[PDB]
Amino acid sequence: PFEFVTYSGEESSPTRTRILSAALSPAERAIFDVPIEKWLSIDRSSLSGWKCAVPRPVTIEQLRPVDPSDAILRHIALYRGPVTDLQLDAIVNAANTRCLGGGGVDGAIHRVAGPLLLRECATFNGCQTGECRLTKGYQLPARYVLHTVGPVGERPDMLRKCYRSILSLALKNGLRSIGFCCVSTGVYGYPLLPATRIALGETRKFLEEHGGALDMCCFACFQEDEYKTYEKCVG
After folding, report:
1. Is 186 marked as a binding-site residue?
2. Can you tell me which residues bind ADP (predicted)?
3. Residue 105 annotated as binding site
4. What domains does the chain contain, in order, with CATH numbers?
5. For residues 175-189, b (16+ Cβ closer than 10 Å) or e, as one string?
6. CA neighbours within 13 Å on the CB side: how many for 172?
7. Are 140 and 91 in contact, with CB atoms under 8 Å apart?
8. Is 58 within any annotated ligand binding site?
């Protein structure tokens, strides 16, 4: 009934051309051609080209909410592991401005999802800082990927704007569960604790104003320092 909103903002190309010129099998081409709106509910195993690349996905049912009693914290969990394990409606990819893969979480999301993720990214012209692109998740257990570009260094309005762009696209398109990674921390140099407070603060904001639209915001903390910082902040 609705066309998805796939970019939160308003609108090198040789590389994009080369990525898009690569041959596809007929089975891969059929996956790539599924309309973005249908991917959420399609039976992915009905497509002969598809498989899930994560042997034991983590489902909503397996996540421990921070506090079941609380109207907000029943919808938040922490996960000790990579965001790519999470079988949710979307996971967040901490991309760069080119939005064509890279190192760290960007690179691992591309490896698990398979080469169609890169190909879909090559159909649009990058992602501005503060904004979010939506793509299918291909071989990930999660249905979609929310590609966001965080700021370099400690720019709080810009980082807030990432979390807003992500949560706003999720609400508009009916994505009810989101797996977050730690945007702008590590090599982009946003200090970990202040970044974490922005992430949790914006998420709380959304959960207060839009209770019946979001079932679960999961914060995947692959590293120990990330996990302990989030753990201390939430309870």
Report:
1. yes
2. 105, 182, 184, 186-188, 226
3. yes
4. 1-235 (3.40.220.10)
5. bbbbbbbbbbbeebe
6. 14
7. yes
8. no
